[PDB]
Amino acid sequence: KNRAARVRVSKGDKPVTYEEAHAPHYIAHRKGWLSLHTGNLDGEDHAAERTVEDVFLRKFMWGTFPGCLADQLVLKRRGNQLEICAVVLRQLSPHKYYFLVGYSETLLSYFYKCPVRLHLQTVPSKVVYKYL
């Protein structure tokens, strides 16, 4: 009995998504990595910097778009350029959506001194993999 990145089986009234439903020993087998960088590979460096910075990215964006997201994020770092992909709900107005998008992109670019872009996919209700 191991408790690691898994939801308890309930009576069947708990909507759960793919990534948080599947176990952490099924990551490479039936999942993908949220982030993708080369610091983990051999020859690269600053892997600790990559990890801390991307964790801070996820935290700051999750908390500056609170209540709109319903799943983990997708980070994609090609050389210099950084890309983020999110899945959100149609909770608030496109005005606020675009304002916060530009605000966060500008702040992150100014902070990390790096070209950054982010995309968002709207959903009426969060997709559920199963009822556990």
Binding site: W33, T38, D42, K76, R78
Partner: protein, 133 residues
């Protein structure tokens, strides 16, 4: 229907100096996914063959590194948890490749990287002898 009339071509100048002669452009792609590596190498070899240069494809073995962590927090020495980082190599060699051809090809590929890949260039260029010798 909207097809542009006059294509704006960038300026080009053939400077006075001769272009450098790269003997061999040997690129090595490190990745985590065999399928991503296959797609990337197919892309590269197709671009190279359409540009009109020689090619050759090899597949070095898979390298893996593992290290053991304590499964629990306070007191458990029998039970551990393990991980493994798998890096997969792919080689691509190009012989008899001009300096400017190398420039254009490397610009193309360096813009056409995917994310979860590292790329190591080894450039081999021949030159004549010095004058002081």
């Amino acid at each position: 229907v909207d097809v542009p009339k006059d294509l704006t071509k960038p300026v080009v100048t053939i400077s006075d100096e001769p272009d450098i002669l790269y003997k061999r452009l040997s690129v090595l792609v490190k990745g985590h996914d065999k399928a991503v590596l296959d797609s990337y190498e197919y892309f590269a070899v197709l671009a190279a063959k359409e540009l009109g240069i020689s090619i050759k494809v090899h597949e070095p073995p898979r390298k893996i590194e593992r290290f053991t962590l304590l499964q629990s927090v306070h007191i458990y020495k029998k039970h551990r948890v393990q991980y493994e980082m798998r890096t997969l190599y792919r080689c691509l060699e190009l012989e008899h490749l001009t300096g400017s051809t190398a420039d254009v090809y490397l610009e193309y590929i360096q813009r056409n990287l995917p994310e979860g890949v590292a790329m190591e260039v080894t450039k081999t260029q021949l030159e004549q002898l010095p004058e002081h010798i």
